[model samples]
Target chain A: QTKAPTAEELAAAGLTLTIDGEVARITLSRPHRRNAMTGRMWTELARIGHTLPQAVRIVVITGEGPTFSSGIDLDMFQAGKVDGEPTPFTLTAALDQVIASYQEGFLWLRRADIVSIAAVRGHAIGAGFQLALSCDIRILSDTAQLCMKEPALGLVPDLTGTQPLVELVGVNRAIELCLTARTIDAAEAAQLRLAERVVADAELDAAVDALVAQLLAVPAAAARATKELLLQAGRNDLATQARVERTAQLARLAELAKAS
Target chain B: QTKAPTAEELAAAGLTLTIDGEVARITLSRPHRRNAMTGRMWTELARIGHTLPQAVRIVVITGEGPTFSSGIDLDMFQAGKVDGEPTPFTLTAALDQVIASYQEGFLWLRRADIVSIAAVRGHAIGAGFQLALSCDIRILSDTAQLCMKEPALGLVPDLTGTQPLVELVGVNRAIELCLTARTIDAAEAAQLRLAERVVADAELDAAVDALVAQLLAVPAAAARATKELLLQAGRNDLATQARVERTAQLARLAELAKAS
Candidate 1:
């Protein structure tokens, strides 16, 4: 169980969370700032995960306006701007915990019970790119551009993004993408499996809707089971994984039998 | 420590193992049946991995003829021919052990000591496709057709192929591929990260040689450690992975200092 963030935290992040039936939408609503994520917004994102409606089966995260996001707010690094806020200048060993807290926002997207989709358009740079990578699926508009600007800023990507990046594109390519800080277009993103699928700019929303419907057609319990199996598949050996698949299938069978 | 397999054990698979400088090549030579693997071949493969030469830095696996392989020999699944070998109708209790032993063939390809590359072309179906997936990198011929045919025959892919498949392509894409038992051409395979590179069939050998040369140019210890980290990158948290990277780099630096 993740610790939920407070309303104050969400307010500070300038994000909006709305639950609509079996789907939850987290909108990066600060278009004027290009949806640049603030530290507070990261906390609020974590909170929404904790408080997610039990009925919600899919979580859609997208930014307002043409741009998905332009990375972390440049102002976020400035010292002493916000009260009771820890900045880059703050010194402490507990900083690891702080980073962990921020990561919780993206990490929860891996939960097996729900699927998280990042509907991306325009520029998803730095933190914005990481945020999109954090989700299980990404539906990108033809204009979408993803860039990893962390290395150019003399910083490592610490936002729970590296693993997924490496997993999606493999190590050598991940190194090239991160070190070069190159912008990848939607076609390249789809090629790299960074985007589950790409759509025309006008069709992004419809594509997501169709995907959500497809995801929803599968029984919730079975979907969850399938995800759990996949999440652990890499770590488990063949014999063990075979057992996992069989066990999950048996449980699903029982569920269907009972319902019938 | 893994039990080392012998030269005689590997030969029964109709496989030829050769050493060339720092690279090892495993060639599937039985072209008459399109290199259809047999129970003997599976066991021999496991043996080869267990007993691979310690000095080998890279391993390249390919087939002798046009087709990489044509999956398992249909006759091998029938009773009596393999003697003590477990068949499809074998007891459920021993099934786990049987699968585990066969997995040994491919599992060692993940060893940090050496990098493995599959040079594939033509029909790589079922188990053959799984074998290619087992390797860390795949170089494909333009005409290559990779397919997962196990599910169509009412069997799950149990040759340690599931995890890598899910990792190369996401769970959703993997599910589609395995369930549909669809054939993926070289272009689609590259798009899915199933193939690290693809070229004309004539250039397959040259490409593998070039890749092997590139891999051999890296400092052996550092490359090994780097691979070790990359393999575990998906399972580790950011902080933990950072520490791992740092630790490996520090060791490499210390080695350089000692050499200087």
Candidate 2:
């Protein structure tokens, strides 16, 4: 029942959405402000997730110009609003609800039916780093630098980034990274499993495209089922997970049987 | 009401339990069998978890000889029993309950009250690798080699391993690791976040000791509370996690107030 966003809506949100075949690319287009995100952009992202065409099986998130993002727009901090909407700080009583709404932008990237990849370059700090972490996979350029700047600013990372951050790197490493607010380059990110792949700055796009092609090669149903199973693996006990796997495999087998 | 395990019980289980001050060391003592695990060892492990002293803040798991472990004993496969007990294969009707009991051995290592470290060297295959995965941290010697070895044998990694394995590495890499059943060296393990640190074989013990010393330096209550918060982070939504963090911090603050 969600309405597809118009071009004007996307422009207002400072984002560009392009749907080509099974892939959809979303670019943070405010290079003038280093792609700084705002409440408007987040809501638009959630809308896009709801209204994306059923055929689109992949999402590629990227940034324009030299930097992916410089975190939240400093203007919002000064004005207590973003694109006419009150910021969470300005609406303290509804802070949790407002933050949850913004989190939807990142959470949708975890949908089982589609794989979302973050093509990151330059600095992805604070909220920007969280945005990349929200994706299913991240492919980083040699120029990419990531930092969780929340702790240093006397804030906790509440953008749905902390979960994935802790999951990718263990709690100890996550603590060190967040508490120190230190920037880690592509090589270190690769070692931390924060980036699925890290390539030369010039080859970043090619690496992501290649990975998308490989992912698309798998049958849609199987890929969805597999992703669904893997997503639940962390919360499920071994015996329960084994049973879930069996159920998923059986469903796959049934689909193959019908095709034959 | 749990009684401390006697020396005779530890020997019969093919494990040696040594409690020294704040740390407890569990050694797989059957070097002649290359530390091959059996039903007795697993149940004894569960018993040890239940009876560990309250003062023990850390648990270090290691093997007696050059090899950490060669995984399950082939004797169980050939004889259909381990130390006179029926294996999960032999007790298909009660397989769920049997496996759950066996998994208790590994699951307790994740308890928040104490941190568990796996000091791995040489080969840690199948059950051995799963054992390492169960721990909070793993430090591997350069000679270490790890393998899931479950899928290739037409078995799932049901020993409480799949969750942590997939948690440490993402789903795609985990799928590749399990499906291919390939061996990964310590360097690759470090890159995969499977090992926190990888040192030369001669330095392995020193590195583990140094880490243990550092971990022990943290006040026990604070360390315990922090670990508990982190363990739940993966499953909690951002807003919920932030709330949990606030509650934990308040508790710590109250304790500090009393101390001052």
Candidate 3:
């Protein structure tokens, strides 16, 4: 049998910091469960996301645990409170709130001021998988494994799962992934459009660093505008979006000599 | 060699129907070339899609001429009506309005009260492919063939095709589909999350009938509210969306319960 940790233990797990010009590093801590997520972490994430330092232009989330995350702390779904109390009911309303809270944990990753990257390694199954999907770009390790494990649990995907997942992969393919709840290894993910690129675990940081350096090389104003454009690409129509693109491009051109 | 019809013939061949209750059925009538779409047809579609009957609860688009749409009308592309004909000269202003109009044609399909279904058969290519993607659900014939023809023609997809297409498929794979511009067979279409189901061409009408009958079977108030709730599921965050769902559900619960 596995040992159960108190809520305080889970709270002590995550290591986060803002440093080195612009990177906000949010490390998933909990080596035992592969950095599996706990309820408190989700709440903390929402807090951290909303209060990100202005100096942080890009946020990098990675694993400090054995893997990025194994999934939710299976314990969260079980009937034990972190402080040795009984957990609340898991009825529709309660289940609904839990999913929403989890989303709060993810949505901050998409804050307009910063570009976000999920630097994943090993197995990121179920909620662990959806958390990574929350990022703007995924720089994955070759050993990374992603599975939408909800269907297997008799649930359709929630916790900010369906939109980005569906947006990246077409509906037909999404349904297949959800229905089968199959794991897509890194190699296949890059080919199928899940991972941007797959690299050896050791090379993962360098890969992300190199890409971020390239992004940083561009004028910050231009880069920010372009990022905004692509993000809106999904939510806005073509013409309105095209205008957004031009408006930014012209502004960049007009302010050519204004870079800091 | 397959016979090619004149522009006049192709335009004359299109079908516009206000049939069987409040549904407007627009069928591509030229099946010989798998129902290639003409420029005039696209214009008409922009007009007709907006003019959907206020009384109509749904819109049905299908291939009547033996196919869905083979892609674009070859003659239109050949006529130089594309390219610089009405191109935006300057990027001074934003393209929000432009892209919005482009997105409008597709968004109308998702209007909750009046859902749209693409009853497709044969190839739906390029704009033809996006036309189908615009619908709420797809009841496809086993004979359907699909291709995102933008890249094949030396251009990236720009008909507001990216989002909905991505929504079905994830971004990584959506890029693969665009960069490679591969043809997706019917079985793969359903498997990929493009088409919901693939029925025999002979059984397509029957399947659609079954689906529509099923949808109509629900009480109109409940059905409409449920549809709005699902749309809200996509448009808003879980907490906000759930609140909307509750308000809707509560209102729905206290209904007259009329069979009509």
Candidate 4:
């Protein structure tokens, strides 16, 4: 069973969620800390995913203020807690499940029924970069800077980011990016396919809105089915994929027939 | 039980295999027909993949003339035969295995033991585009043009191309490209991450050579291991991937310690 969070819950998580028509927007609202993430934020994200209305077909994730995110709040690493709440490192014995739970926050963005977009600007580093990677598409402002800083800090990016990152950039380039943990600007990000579209900082919102409108213009059922097919494409062999495509098309045709 | 093809076999298949030290170059040699491909050519490709010497670490697949390939040789569709041999459509009963065998030609390019590069000039259409897609990296001449014309012909791209195509470009874009069968120039290909590097037609060879040299400079074992890790990244969850990464790093560390 899933339940929507109350106003207090969202405030504690430093997030704001707004639902309008077929779209949902989730904003990281802790501008005071440059939208730094905490354990509560991730859990709240997972909760939001579970509680989203059936009519919601699109999800837009963005940060409030200048920066998309500065990654994890430094205070969370202090004394293995943030705001008196236990942090990831605090639960060493059950770290696997703990990490898995945190990843749920990111994984739901890939749900077949909805399309998720990350609208990024300024710095999106470490967890911030991972968050962007989790989305189906990323729209970045020209001021954006991206970095996979975890590896440089002796950590692997375990927030469900590695797969999409590697999928976007080949393994060789991915290894280079992660191993060096260097920052790349919007231009390089676009070259790397890290950003689907990059626009001037002033036009970021307009660019994202245009993309959202274009995505929404596609028939919802077809969009969902296509997303599911694409997600499985990497795992299926050619023959198997052809069969899957046939099945999917059959379903689409049947829907069309019924509609007619 | 893999055996190298003899000169007569290579000639009959309209291809040339030149092995020099650690590099193997495979050239499509039927310029008279704009390097059109046939069943024999694909089968020969599989044979070359199987029989490439263990010492070889790089494979460069290119065309002899302006066009990379015109795809399927058109005649392969005439009377369901090409050069008097039965074609894929001819063997309807075992078509699955037949198509799988053709796919074997492309699949081996992704092997962990070696890196494959597709150097393209002019057109890479349908099967030709797929051949380039099969490689780990694609370097194209500024004159290059790519099209996924299968869906437009009422056929799905079943030649192991769909997955990589969708992986490089998202599903919506892939659908648009496949459905329309539109040609895209090198600049668009580069923007889409379909081409790792695109150079002026005159500089194509030099660009590929430079990339080959850079690839060769990396430690062979590490490159192989990293590629294997990356290939699996799309299918593995973050927790599982982290474990896999740790295992790979341990092996690398062991090899380094022994060398030290």
Candidate 5:
């Protein structure tokens, strides 16, 4: 249901969007910049999410180069201006708006109908780590190291990452990781459930491909319905959720009978 | 928020509640029935939750015998009644209400101010498995085995177990576990993060006690506040949650400052 980025926006963001069948891949291609995010990039990413095609059931986001992302460009915090866009200092009233615009880039990944997987290699630091957390699942390479550097820099993770971080790993572990601003290797990441799966660096893409295939094997409607139910499980009370479960099951069973 | 059972009510339920300093323990007795939960037992458990002393910070639930629990008594399903109470078959309109009340026993463990731990020794089947999931932390013995048996009996896990099960484990794993009604050993349970930690059967109590001590070591106000924040993290968006985090931090800081 979200929108997509315009050609100009995509070009300016220095990212490539490729559609293959039911799968859509977004590659962070600013290798020279280590895919460091800037205000412009965030805006473009949000645009992509807003205008993303409805056909995209699987969205795989990854870096084009060895490193997933070095995180926010140090320059973004420097001159109080980024890519001619107003920075936090200039946007006294618009500060929240600007941050929200950046968050949209990550928020859409949690959409129920879509399965978003972050494919990580090398370092995923600060904003990059948050980006990874935004997805429904994360697949990490053995060489990958994820770090939450916001707290170390005297900042809170305002990007939608904090909740998912706390959800994937418990609040205690999330606090430890963020407060310490330490790098967690793939092994530790897997142990923490921060990464759903991990593999050798060489096998990262292949592993992702296999997973995508497996995920896609399920009927699309069922997957979406299941995802929708699971998403609301946290918020719904037992009685309410039971009613939802019954309704969902009724619908699913009817569809199955029809197909048969 | 719920009504507490009277002393006469607790006597018939066969559940024994004991308080020790800052900790409270609930032992599911009825060894003759393999600790199967009767409707009366559920009522008493909910009563315990509703009437918990304000002084109690940690609540531990365990079975008195070797097995944690054999699950719900089969006799409750055979007859059109259970423990002087009408069964679901008898009161079709009140099925949801019945389930919801039963869920209250497990649901109250999730209260922000309390730290609930489940100490499992042997078989934790059906509702027993759910009891463990209801707690914030689960300490499993080497001999512990957990299984969700609802589906095998052509029923869904409606005891508020579905959400926590899906939460502790991801959707896919939860679906597979529930549908297959398979039992997982302590090692697999730990791997799935179902159990916080597992130990030798003999060490289960000691492990829980140690964890309780460590948990009590934290300042009560801070722990409760932190838990309250974590519980709502799922519902709040990043910006709103950031504001919440800031407010929480501000209050904690003020408290510490005053204490100093």
Candidate 6:
């Protein structure tokens, strides 16, 4: 049997992490199936996010291969398809369990303590589209295509994508989209305010980097607190939210982490 | 018998409806009570909306008194009075049910299928303010004082008011307004977009007539479809929204009378 890969080697495999000053790059390494996800990968993501250095402020999430991800492996539908799967059940029940797991994967990106960006290029479909939405901001390439494909598959996008999508758009509109199911190109997506910025495919990386650089210029405490406040402002009633804002900011008081 | 009032003999007594070419105007004719609503008024309103003339393209709803409504009369709580006789309950739960029914009279305007406008020249407090919000658009005279006075009186805006109110302003801002229990003047109302347009009190009626004139110039089918599409566009996933546009146009072809 081949020797197990070293810890450094494993880290370099599916998920890649690099820190250059304050910018932390969390890139999805498997691009062949548009970065189709695995359970380990999802668990790994939460782990990565949990331990991020407080000094490492901006976190950029991008795809390594073709599309962001073509959702789950297509063959998960049949027996003996995925890397390791033995049996199958009614379509509805199997999907129910699988989709629940996918929801957990997307939930990791929304931690109020961190500002996550999805730097998308090419196709971001099904669960992939939901993943991009999980970010605090999205910087997309003009070549990108986003489709809410679950409904077409006779399934709902139950991956905790509901609240954020509705929050960005609205309830009636969200229901309208989920019911009809279609794909949106970048130009229209930008007009919808769904994508913050869209650039040519080649320039997407540069555009995202520039934004991250600009974000870093603000005092870290203010940036963290404001986002925390806006997010909490939506979840709680008044008096409780006021206290949350104060407590969150109170924890961030310091000059040592500030950059000139 | 008393002479019939100038506004169409209050056809059917407390309710009245008139189709003026392309403009359908519904008036709350209870000038004696500042148009304070009752249960029957709401069912009739939802009915008029269903029977709208095929040619009645733009609907304008307004009151014919100095006060749009002061909400429920406080004396509504006064039960059989006798010096220190054990206080009697006013059966407020029944009144709440009735008022809620009346609030739905205006709530139908929030549907995207038609462009609805509210014209106000006096106080539209509590349920009255919410009635204005149900419309797709609003115009207020300078003298109009708007209040979301529900929370101030130890109640939430139970009618369909708070839902759309929260939608217009995001949840956080909505919470702030509802909790603070603030009163908004015509100018401030215009800023919140609660009122699309505001003008001097003297020009209120003229301003409304002019707006109705301009709206009639647009194609009926096109105007209705555009309104529906826009409402959905404000908040929904893009990929699926493309198809929503298709179904709305499809339904319009049947003149809506074919099916709801």
TM-score of chain B of each: 0.93, 0.97, 0.80, 0.96, 0.93, 0.78
Q: Of the candidates shown, which would achieve the greatest lDDT relative to the real structure?
A: 2
Comparing 1 and 6 on DockQ, the stronger one = 1
Task: Tell me which of candidates 4 and 5 scores higher on TM-score.
Answer: 4
lDDT of 6 by residue, B74-143 (tens): 4334675222221224347766665655565676676544567778878888777877777766778898
Q: Model 5 - which docking category? A: incorrect
Candidate 2 lDDT at A231 equals: 86
- Of 1 and 4, the candidate ranking higher by TM-score: 4
Give the TM-score of chain B in candidate 3. 0.80
- Give TM per candidate: 0.59, 0.59, 0.54, 0.60, 0.59, 0.54
Weakest lDDT window of 10 consecutive positions for candidate 4 chain A: A249-258
- lDDT, model 2, position A255: 91
Per-residue lDDT tens digits for candidate 5, residues A141-211, read: 99999999998999989878888887778789988998899998999998888777789999998999987
**Chain A (candidate 2) TM-score to true chain A:** 0.97
Q: What share of the true interface contacts does candidate 5 keep?
A: 0.10
**Residue B22 shift from truth in candidate 3, angstroms:** 32
* Residue pairs in candidate 4 whose N, alpha carbon or C atoms collide under 3 angstroms: none
Over the stretch A125-155, how does candidate 6's per-residue lDDT look in tens digits?
A: 8667877888889998988887766545534
Clashing pairs in 6: A31-A65, A169-B235, A170-B235, A182-B239
Q: Model 6 chain B — which ten-residue stretch has the worst lDDT?
A: B81-90
DockQ of 6: 0.05
Whole-model lDDT, candidate 6?
Answer: 0.65
CA displacement after TM-score superposition, residue B141 of candidate 2 (Å): 0.8
lDDT of 5 by residue, B1-260 (tens): 45556556665786877888878888887777778887778867887988887888889999988989988788766546677787544442355456667767777888988999999989999888878888899999999999887555544555567788877886545643653466889998999989999999888889988999899999899999999999777768889999999999999999999999
User: What TM value does model 1 have?
Assistant: 0.59
- lDDT score of model 3? 0.68
